[PDB]
Amino acid sequence: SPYSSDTTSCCFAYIARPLPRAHIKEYFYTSGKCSNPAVVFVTRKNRQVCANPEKKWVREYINSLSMS
């Protein structure tokens, strides 16, 4: 996704099983205005990953992308 235009719909579901945080490069929010907040994880090939940032375990995933 070169632009955020591709990502219009908000994730209302979770991935089958937890994704590898080590293959995650960066993260981004859906739209915010969505019924429920959600953050998409960017894999090596920019696959569509949906995880709820309100979860403590998910926050750790986002954290690894933020701090050093």
């Binding site: 579901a13 979770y14 991935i15 089958a16 696959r47 569509q48 949906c50």
Partner: peptide, 27 residues
């Protein structure tokens, strides 16, 4: 033999988890 593989490439299994989610169900 029995085969149950449909080639997992994320787009399928990984991102097709929906009927297994509790969408407003009282259990």
């Amino acid at each position: 033999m029995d085969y149950q593989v449909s080639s997992p490439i994320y787009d399928i299994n990984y991102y097709t988890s929906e009927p297994a989610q509790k969408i407003n169900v009282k259990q």
